[PDB]
Design a protein around this ligand. Structure first.
Ligand code: NA
Ligand code: NA
Ligand code: NA
Ligand code: NA
Ligand code: NA
Ligand code: NA
Lengths: 6, 6, 6, 6, 6, 6, 6, 6, 6, 6, 6, 6
């Protein structure tokens, strides 16, 4: 699983 | 920009 | 529970 | 919890 | 769980 | 202003 | 958690 | 510039 | 002015 | 701005 | 994981 | 300005 914000 | 809640 | 993503 | 990114 | 104010 | 994150 | 004022 | 809270 | 960071 | 990666 | 601000 | 890298 993972997450990204930009 | 962004946001995450869990 | 859950999640909120902008 | 969560995150806020500008 | 979480919360955010801005 | 500002922000509060739990 | 955290907070920011400006 | 930017900011991050977690 | 200024800033406060937790 | 920026990025956050889990 | 990681993060970047600019 | 500048940069921050985790
Ligand atoms: Na992850
Ligand atoms: Na957003
Ligand atoms: Na919380
Ligand atoms: Na804090
Ligand atoms: Na910003
Ligand atoms: Na890191």
């Amino acid at each position: 699983g993972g997450y990204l914000l930009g």
